Amino acid sequence: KGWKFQGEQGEFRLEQPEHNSYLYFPLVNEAGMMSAVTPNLHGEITSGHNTFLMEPVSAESLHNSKASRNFWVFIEGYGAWSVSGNSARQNAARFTGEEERSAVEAGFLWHAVTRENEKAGLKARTVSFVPVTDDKIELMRVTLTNTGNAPLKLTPTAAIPLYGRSADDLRDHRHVTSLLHRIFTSEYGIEVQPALSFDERGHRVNKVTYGVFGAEAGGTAPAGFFPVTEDFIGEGGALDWPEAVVANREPDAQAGTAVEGYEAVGALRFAPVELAPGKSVSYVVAMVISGDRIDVGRYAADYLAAGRFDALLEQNRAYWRDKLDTVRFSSGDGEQDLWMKWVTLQPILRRLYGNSFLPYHDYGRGGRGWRDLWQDCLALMVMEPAEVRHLLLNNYAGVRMDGSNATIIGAGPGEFVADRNNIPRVWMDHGAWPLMTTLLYLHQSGDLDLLFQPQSYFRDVFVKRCRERDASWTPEQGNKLLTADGQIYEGTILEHILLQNIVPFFNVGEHGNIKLEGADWNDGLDLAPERGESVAFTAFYASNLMELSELLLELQKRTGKDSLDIAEEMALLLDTLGKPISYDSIQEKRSLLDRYYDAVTPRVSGKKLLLDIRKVAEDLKRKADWAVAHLRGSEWIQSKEGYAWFNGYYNNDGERVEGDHPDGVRMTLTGQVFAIMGGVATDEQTEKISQAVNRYLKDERIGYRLNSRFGGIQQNLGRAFGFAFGHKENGAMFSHMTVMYANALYKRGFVQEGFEVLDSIYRLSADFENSRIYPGVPEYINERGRGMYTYLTGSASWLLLTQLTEVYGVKGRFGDLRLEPKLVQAQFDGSGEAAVETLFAGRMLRVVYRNPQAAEHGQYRVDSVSLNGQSVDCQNDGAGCLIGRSLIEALPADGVHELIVTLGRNIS
Amino acid sequence: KGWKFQGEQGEFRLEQPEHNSYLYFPLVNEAGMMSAVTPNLHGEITSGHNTFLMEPVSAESLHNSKASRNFWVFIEGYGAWSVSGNSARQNAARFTGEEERSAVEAGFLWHAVTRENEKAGLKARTVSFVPVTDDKIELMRVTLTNTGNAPLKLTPTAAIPLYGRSADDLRDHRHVTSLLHRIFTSEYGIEVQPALSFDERGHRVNKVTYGVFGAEAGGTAPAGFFPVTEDFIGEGGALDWPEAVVANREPDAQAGTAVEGYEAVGALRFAPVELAPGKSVSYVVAMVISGDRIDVGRYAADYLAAGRFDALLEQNRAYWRDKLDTVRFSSGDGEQDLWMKWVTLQPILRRLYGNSFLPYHDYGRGGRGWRDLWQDCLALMVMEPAEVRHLLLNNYAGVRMDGSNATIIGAGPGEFVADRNNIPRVWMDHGAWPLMTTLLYLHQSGDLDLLFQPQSYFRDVFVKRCRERDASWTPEQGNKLLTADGQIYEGTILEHILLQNIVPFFNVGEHGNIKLEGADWNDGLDLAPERGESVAFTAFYASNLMELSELLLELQKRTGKDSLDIAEEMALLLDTLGKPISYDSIQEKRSLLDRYYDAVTPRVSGKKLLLDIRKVAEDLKRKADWAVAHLRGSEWIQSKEGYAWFNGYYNNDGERVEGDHPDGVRMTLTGQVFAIMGGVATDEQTEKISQAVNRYLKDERIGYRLNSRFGGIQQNLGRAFGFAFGHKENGAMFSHMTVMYANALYKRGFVQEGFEVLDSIYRLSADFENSRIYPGVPEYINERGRGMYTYLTGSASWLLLTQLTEVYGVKGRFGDLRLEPKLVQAQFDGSGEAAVETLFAGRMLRVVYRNPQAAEHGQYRVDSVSLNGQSVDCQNDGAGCLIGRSLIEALPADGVHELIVTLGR
Numbered sequence A: 001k002g003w004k005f006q007g008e009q010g011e012f013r014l015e016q017p018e019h020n021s022y023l024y025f026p027l028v029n030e031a032g033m034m035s036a037v038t039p040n041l042h043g044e045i046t047s048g049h050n051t052f053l054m055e056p057v058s059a060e061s062l063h064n065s066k067a068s069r070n071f072w073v074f075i076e077g078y079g080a081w082s083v084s085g086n087s088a089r090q091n092a093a094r095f096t097g098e099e100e101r102s103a104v105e106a107g108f109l110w111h112a113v114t115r116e117n118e119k120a121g122l123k124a125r126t127v128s129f130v131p132v133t134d135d136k137i138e139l140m141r142v143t144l145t146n147t148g149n150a151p152l153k154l155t156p157t158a159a160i161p162l163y164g165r166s167a168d169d170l171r172d173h174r175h176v177t178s179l180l181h182r183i184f185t186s187e188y189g190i191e192v193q194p195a196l197s198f199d200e201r202g203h204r205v206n207k208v209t210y211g212v213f214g215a216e217a218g219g220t221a222p223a224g225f226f227p228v229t230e231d232f233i234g235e236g237g238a239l240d241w242p243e244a245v246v247a248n249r250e251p252d253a254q255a256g257t258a259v260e261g262y263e264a265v266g267a268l269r270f271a272p273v274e275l276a277p278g279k280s281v282s283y284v285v286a287m288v289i290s291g292d293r294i295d296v297g298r299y300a301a302d303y304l305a306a307g308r309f310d311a312l313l314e315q316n317r318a319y320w321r322d323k324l325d326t327v328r329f330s331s332g333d334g335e336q337d338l339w340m341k342w343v344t345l346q347p348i349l350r351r352l353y354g355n356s357f358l359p360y361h362d363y364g365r366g367g368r369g370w371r372d373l374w375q376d377c378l379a380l381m382v383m384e385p386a387e388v389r390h391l392l393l394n395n396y397a398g399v400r401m402d403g404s405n406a407t408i409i410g411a412g413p414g415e416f417v418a419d420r421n422n423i424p425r426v427w428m429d430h431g432a433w434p435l436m437t438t439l440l441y442l443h444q445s446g447d448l449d450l451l452f453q454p455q456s457y458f459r460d461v462f463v464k465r466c467r468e469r470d471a472s473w474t475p476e477q478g479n480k481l482l483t484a485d486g487q488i489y490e491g492t493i494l495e496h497i498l499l500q501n502i503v504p505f506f507n508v509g510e511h512g513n514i515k516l517e518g519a520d521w522n523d524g525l526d527l528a529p530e531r532g533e534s535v536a537f538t539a540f541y542a543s544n545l546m547e548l549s550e551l552l553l554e555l556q557k558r559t560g561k562d563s564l565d566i567a568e569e570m571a572l573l574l575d576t577l578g579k580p581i582s583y584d585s586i587q588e589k590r591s592l593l594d595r596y597y598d599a600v601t602p603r604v605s606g607k608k609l610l611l612d613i614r615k616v617a618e619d620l621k622r623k624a625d626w627a628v629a630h631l632r633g634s635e636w637i638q639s640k641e642g643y644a645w646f647n648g649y650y651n652n653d654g655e656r657v658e659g660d661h662p663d664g665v666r667m668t669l670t671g672q673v674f675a676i677m678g679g680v681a682t683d684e685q686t687e688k689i690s691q692a693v694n695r696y697l698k699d700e701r702i703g704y705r706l707n708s709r710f711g712g713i714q715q716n717l718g719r720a721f722g723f724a725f726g727h728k729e730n731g732a733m734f735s736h737m738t739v740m741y742a743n744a745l746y747k748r749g750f751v752q753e754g755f756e757v758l759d760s761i762y763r764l765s766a767d768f769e770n771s772r773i774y775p776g777v778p779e780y781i782n783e784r785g786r787g788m789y790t791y792l793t794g795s796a797s798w799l800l801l802t803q804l805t806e807v808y809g810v811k812g813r814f815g816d817l818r819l820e821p822k823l824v825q826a827q828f829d830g831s832g833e834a835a836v837e838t839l840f841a842g843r844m845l846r847v848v849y850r851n852p853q854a855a856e857h858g859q860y861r862v863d864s865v866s867l868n869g870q871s872v873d874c875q876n877d878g879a880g881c882l883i884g885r886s887l888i889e890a891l892p893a894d895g896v897h898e899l900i901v902t903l904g905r906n907i908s
Numbered sequence B: 001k002g003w004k005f006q007g008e009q010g011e012f013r014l015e016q017p018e019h020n021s022y023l024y025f026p027l028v029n030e031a032g033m034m035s036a037v038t039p040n041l042h043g044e045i046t047s048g049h050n051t052f053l054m055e056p057v058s059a060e061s062l063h064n065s066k067a068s069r070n071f072w073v074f075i076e077g078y079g080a081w082s083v084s085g086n087s088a089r090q091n092a093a094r095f096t097g098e099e100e101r102s103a104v105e106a107g108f109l110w111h112a113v114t115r116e117n118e119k120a121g122l123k124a125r126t127v128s129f130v131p132v133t134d135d136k137i138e139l140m141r142v143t144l145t146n147t148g149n150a151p152l153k154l155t156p157t158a159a160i161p162l163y164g165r166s167a168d169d170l171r172d173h174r175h176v177t178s179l180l181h182r183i184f185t186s187e188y189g190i191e192v193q194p195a196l197s198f199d200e201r202g203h204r205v206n207k208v209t210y211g212v213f214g215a216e217a218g219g220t221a222p223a224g225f226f227p228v229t230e231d232f233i234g235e236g237g238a239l240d241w242p243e244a245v246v247a248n249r250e251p252d253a254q255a256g257t258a259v260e261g262y263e264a265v266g267a268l269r270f271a272p273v274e275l276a277p278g279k280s281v282s283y284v285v286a287m288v289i290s291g292d293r294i295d296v297g298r299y300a301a302d303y304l305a306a307g308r309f310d311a312l313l314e315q316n317r318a319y320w321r322d323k324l325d326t327v328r329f330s331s332g333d334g335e336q337d338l339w340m341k342w343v344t345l346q347p348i349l350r351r352l353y354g355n356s357f358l359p360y361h362d363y364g365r366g367g368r369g370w371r372d373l374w375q376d377c378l379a380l381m382v383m384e385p386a387e388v389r390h391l392l393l394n395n396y397a398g399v400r401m402d403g404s405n406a407t408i409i410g411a412g413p414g415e416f417v418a419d420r421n422n423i424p425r426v427w428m429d430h431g432a433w434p435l436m437t438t439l440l441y442l443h444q445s446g447d448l449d450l451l452f453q454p455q456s457y458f459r460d461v462f463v464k465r466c467r468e469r470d471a472s473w474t475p476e477q478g479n480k481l482l483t484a485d486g487q488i489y490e491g492t493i494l495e496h497i498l499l500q501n502i503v504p505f506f507n508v509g510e511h512g513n514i515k516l517e518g519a520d521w522n523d524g525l526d527l528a529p530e531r532g533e534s535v536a537f538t539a540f541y542a543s544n545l546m547e548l549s550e551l552l553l554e555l556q557k558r559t560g561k562d563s564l565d566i567a568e569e570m571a572l573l574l575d576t577l578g579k580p581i582s583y584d585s586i587q588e589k590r591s592l593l594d595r596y597y598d599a600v601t602p603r604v605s606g607k608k609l610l611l612d613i614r615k616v617a618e619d620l621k622r623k624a625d626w627a628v629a630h631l632r633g634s635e636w637i638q639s640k641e642g643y644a645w646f647n648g649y650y651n652n653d654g655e656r657v658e659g660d661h662p663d664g665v666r667m668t669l670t671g672q673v674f675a676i677m678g679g680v681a682t683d684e685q686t687e688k689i690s691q692a693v694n695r696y697l698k699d700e701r702i703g704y705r706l707n708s709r710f711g712g713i714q715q716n717l718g719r720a721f722g723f724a725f726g727h728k729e730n731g732a733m734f735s736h737m738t739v740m741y742a743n744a745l746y747k748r749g750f751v752q753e754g755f756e757v758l759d760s761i762y763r764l765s766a767d768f769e770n771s772r773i774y775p776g777v778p779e780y781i782n783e784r785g786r787g788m789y790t791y792l793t794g795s796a797s798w799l800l801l802t803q804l805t806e807v808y809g810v811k812g813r814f815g816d817l818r819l820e821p822k823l824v825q826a827q828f829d830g831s832g833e834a835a836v837e838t839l840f841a842g843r844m845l846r847v848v849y850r851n852p853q854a855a856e857h858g859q860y861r862v863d864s865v866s867l868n869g870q871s872v873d874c875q876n877d878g879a880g881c882l883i884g885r886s887l888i889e890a891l892p893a894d895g896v897h898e899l900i901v902t903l904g905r
Ligand SMILES: O=P(O)(O)O[C@H]1O[C@H](CO)[C@@H](O)[C@H](O)[C@H]1O
Pocket: A371, A521, A522, A523, A524, A729, A735, A736, A779, A789, A792, A793, A794, A795
């Protein structure tokens, strides 16, 4: 069987875990230690691309490399034995039905491997976690227990294989760079500090030190060390059967030894020990990365002294419990509520790993992309709202004056990097996500004033959305847009938003939809920059323009403001205010955009125009209406079989991608999602889209595919079609897009369809027989039902947000709290209750929905709402109940405040 | 217990070979299949940086990765068993004293792993080689033998783990790129053809196909396949304990199956077989790389049909025997004579591997560097002369009009590439080696006319020896030096040579020796381009100038010609012909060089001057004499203990590198070698140098170190000092430099000292207990006595050349054959003979030296010489006996012609 949850805090257990390929669990802290641990203690440990403590790995390494973390016991009358089962002898029992009993347990945020040797009568339990302290450190505790009837004599040896340099050195100059190693032994362990680093940064002095240290439970140091890998393993040996352990050799080194020029292993030999029947002995090992030589005394006192491991583990458990208790779901699906706690962890992991340094994520180098700056705000708005305002303001510094944006993110707040040499890529969807995220912030917080903050615009060598290079640019002008007088231009946050959505409107292909450029959301649609079109994201931009129009009008009626400060050159793009052009003409839209580019390159005038907020809203509505009409009139398609949906793409030959085709209908999920979400699709078109999706995309084994099968490579569209069908962006169940589809369905009132979609993701993810993953939502479910690219996927943010804001219906409306449950009957528990604890206006609320009548969605309404005891007026704007912000703000800061919403049946 | 030679052809055997870490053996062909094989059949298989059939590896992989080539037998009553010992079960016996008996045998050019299972009564023998056909293919034959008293029932499964893409994908996008895999099964095996390649070339369509195919001895196809790696190994399995084999599962796939998106393994399941007591069964596996889908029928007919393996192996043995029989040594040291046969193989390997794609050589990408263009000619002149003239002419196309040279070598003959990635590096020694190699060609061949062939000069954005960028440069100027009128300038080969040696003469540092620039021979001396000086290579350039002077004079007296065609601008550099400058002035030498650079940048005039050959020789001699005087007067140094030698370097602070120092004397071998070789060092200075070398550099465990210990990193000198002492260019016994030291000693008559040096390299290399290498000379012997960077080192070329041309003394003199033995008494065999078979003027000669008087070197002379029977005039008393080229050319083409040289007191 799969894993089974234990207790009510999200802890789980998996029996015989190493009977599954490619499993791994994450251990990480804010300080920057990033680890992965497999059932046999393989994985990796790193603090960045250039500073790997253990060897860099991909998926195949987890079986093929012998260099796991290990801890050995030489058992008298038996021999060498690995506490995680990673020895030649133990591995040779796999598939013979003579395997030792074993298990993984894990929680927030820690991991435990158990193993039993019935022959010798020994049990081992090895706990890994990364402390929540300001050090880059991983700790290991091995506890050995004599489960037999007589004394055992054991000789323990810890062994953490070291790498201690850049992943650039994996093979390229791998051996040469081993010659730069300097190993220093001391009382508690082994430090490795290369003299130099050779990697893509060049040849440089290194001070970075990688440390492996250990002690018995009582604080007693190791008896000695085998710091040199080839000496530890022996001539013709290996890390899963090393001579030093197998032949029980005396230590090569004591404290104060230096050794130069060899690959290193943190091999710590402990004193031999006699273990009474029933009694235990424990060992603590620490793996440390530091910017210089390590104060080994301080680390020994903080991590290896008696009871430090146990105390730090409690500290770790409490810190993570505190992070995750910001969102708690409670329903008739107890297994799913606890599964969602792991989903709730994932957005934090993506931040702390920088979408990198786990075995599948083998290409990542730790940075953040443009999308992450926005996506990371979604989890934060729900879990840690305080930080979000600062992050959004800074993010808008990266926008260029042509609507595009910096694609390389820097160290500082609002720091972005120019790449003046590389042939650079524009993703056409990059302008769409900021508004969506910002709108969410406005509705949760009520902070409408954010839209009128000043901010600069990014500027580098690339202009006209990276079509041309600029001649008159030097390093002396700096990375910000200048005025005629040479000053840094600043526009409203709103001016930035306008620009990001208006520019794409005019940037149309030969079929009238917005150009694909380098790709949209789908990174694999990278081969149609000349003639490609993302109809899919045209519906997103159309919807954004309409929301912008509604937003401006609502700013007038709430703020009172009549005016918008916008740069004079942007007035060209708001042509409804001057001499309107025909939006039916492609030539005219292109020409007007070329005029705009010329007006703002290399500099702007600096002069701003002050425009009527209602007249600007009218321009935005006109554009939106045009796009809505064109999409419905020109990109609504039907197969001969009678299904109908929206074409999502035109390829680099100007050909429509979707519809009937030799070898089968071509359809994409991406082409439907934003049409539905934003209102381009009518209700009738949404019913039809769902049927076409269910017909062409919904697989009975793997769920809602990102696209149907296109035969072979598609070199006029994208490299994604080089992937085998059902993998990555070619037809896998790609969680992010699928969650957004569900989100869109819920938004539009298609609740049963939306539920089916969300429930599919959970069922696939948790069907361990096929998925072979721990709790969490993967990036994708593949052709064989396996969970791929675990933990770091952005889909988790959306899953969390969709459950909170759509399914349980707890969301903001200009800072006021709206309650609009879209829960189905089957989600209510044995007392007809389903609840969510969440943060809103700086207070923890337990929103409990009571459905005593057991009504299905559509058959229920809100009958009453009581807040912490007393009654509440729900001044109901539309289909749900609306509570004013002040009533929540008036609550006590401490404690969880209960808000009981009673549901009853409809009339008539 | 090391390896032991067997027979007289250089075949060897090693018992319990996998009791040694990091061992590997090379298998390679001209077609481009490049392989390495370890005692457990690990290593790698590739046709280039971007086309790896098996996973790319470094040293640590050879133990740490489970993905060796493998062949499994599921033995009834026993279970899974690897014919090479690479299974979890078999590995778990290591260090328990329950290991199975095993062995490697190898020869030219093939490899054999044997193993015995005493429990089951089964012996396996697995032979690997690369055929000498026009395909990129490696073959494996596994022969299983029942050594027990009752029948065995066996189920065989071959398993070659596939990678099938660029080494760029090793980790970076490793998994993503697995999704591009397309696996096709057919009757005889498995093809992998990725739909696309993602690597440093970009995202592209791929057609390259990687194939694993197999058959029984009779040509019977496999019963089926497990083409998908994760299915073959099983959930929680591994390539050294795969479920498909361990649980004896039925095949996943038959012929005609396609599978997309997974890592692949060439896992071929053969029919179960009952093996009688005493009898054998064999299997042939073929690993193929092709530019498109493979014609599997043709490969099956050519490689898998009955008796094809055995026939192709004979063909391989004969081809290599024929390549290596061009040089054969025979002496009182039989083990060394056979060891040298392996040394003789190495230059061919360096060419065919492009100094890459063996486990230690983990940074190489298959290309050639500037030095290789010259070094590769040394082995060729002795083993395959025909190609050499063309290679030299083409090589000179790479020289720039400032004496520097292109550093990136291209596809075509004489094609050189301009560096698109900024970052230009000049190695100051690059101008020195061409003359040394060319002179050797002139003396072996007699083809003095080569020096007057026309050739272009390379041109790119970088000028003044890559100090400045050129303003008036576009793609529009092209890759060749233009004249004022816009034509491609062509100069004599000799004009190129002059320029390469004269420019460095003026390119001096603040201490008056030639600037280090980006590094010299030592690639690790890369941190003193501003103020560094290579005194070491100043002695080389000084010697080159003198040889050039002697050469020009000898051209007059042999060709008859009195003139040299040289570009007018080069006359500035031959200042003795116009207004001489003072060579004692650094400022004046620098200024004259800056004038020259200005005269030739961006273009030359095209007009040539015709200069007196004797007056040019006079200019060259003047320079040489100046450099010889300055080095002896200013760079001869002494420690307080009283040892004396030549300072080799100034560092980037303008400080002298060598001499007394806190924590110990600093001395380099490189600073001595060319001083000795070229005559800068007098005989007395050479005696003293050898004593200082022996005192400071000669380690009793590891031999002649490249340098003594400098404490810690040396950031004003080179990155080499970041290496642990005794590794790579920081104080290891670095074979190339050590061989050249020996060469220099022999050249100067220090024969006992030279012998000690050459014998040290052999003894260290062959002391397997410490060296842990197969026969051959390594790049270096390290601090623990281990042989490192095997096979591909350029030291082998020099070792071969030094044994032939100095030790046995068989060398050219303007095409005439000179015999000048420098053999010591102990090298003569039991009949007082030592001999060498070698190619000269297109004929195989067996030069046999007879020393009946048992005289030591220095006490013997040449008393008579007979050629195939009749007597020979030796037109020369002094140093050696000199035989005219015609007498050799008059011999029959076929056959080995004996030339008996009798030595007396
Ligand atoms: O892993 P994730 O976040 O689910 O999704 C990943 O692939 C998507 C499709 O190419 C991109 O839009 C995301 O930026 C990327 O992180």
